Amino acid sequence: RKRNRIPLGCTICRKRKVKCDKLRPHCQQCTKTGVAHLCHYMEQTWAEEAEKELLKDNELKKLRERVKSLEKTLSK
């Protein structure tokens, strides 16, 4: 089944299965438990979000390859 809804609570509160006061930047829930730096809200749908991560992973992966290449050239 398709997921068109964009959750209003933060990702962590969702995972922890507890009510999110949904304050921004970070919710009190996360600030309280000390994970405010991990608190964030979804802006796109599950699917758009999945794609985005795939792109970022590939970008990340290729950059590591490139850097290795350059470092290897700076001492060949």
Added chain:
Amino acid sequence: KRNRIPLGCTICRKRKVKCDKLRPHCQQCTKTGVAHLCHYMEQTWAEEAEKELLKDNELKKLRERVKSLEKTLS
């Protein structure tokens, strides 16, 4: 039987005091001279957010190094 993982830093637990929980290192064990030995345990409901935080920080540093190397190569 649940899987409750402690939230404060390893030391404060060990000592049994209240952890201000500040990140990356709490004031509790910054006052006692061990700041950079202060770390927290990984919560399962934080793996993903955590993994995503490394990825971002790393994509960030790699872009700074690629430029730094591209120059040092001339």
Added chain:
DNA sequence: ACGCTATTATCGCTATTAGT
């Protein structure tokens, strides 16, 4: 330093919204 129980977070389970 730590024993010890008041404080506090987990996740089975109830409701409810919404894809087909």
Added chain:
DNA sequence: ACTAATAGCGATAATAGCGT
């Protein structure tokens, strides 16, 4: 309808961190 996603309550397992 049927029931996959969501929201998240709350009994209570367990950590939290106070006070000896």
